[PDB]
Amino acid sequence: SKTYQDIQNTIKKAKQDVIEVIEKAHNNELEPTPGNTLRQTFENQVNRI
């Protein structure tokens, strides 16, 4: 019931993190992480998160 709170917190942070990656790519600020297109760097960031 503490672990539940930690998980939920982590998850929300995660969901939160991905929204900014979506904002950056949606406003063209996600610069292509060398060796990648735009659409790849995005997917990488997301999957990392």
13 CB-contact burial (10 Å; exposed 0-12 / middle 13-18 / buried 19+)? exposed
By the rule CB under 8 A, 10 interacts with other proteins: no
Member of 9, 13, 14, 20 binding other proteins (CB under 8 A): 14
By the rule CB under 8 A, 9 interacts with other proteins: no
By the rule CB under 8 A, 20 interacts with other proteins: no
By the rule CB under 8 A, 34 interacts with other proteins: yes
User: What three-state secondary structure class fits 33?
Assistant: coil
CB 14 within 8 A of CB 49: yes
By the rule CB under 8 A, 11 interacts with other proteins: yes
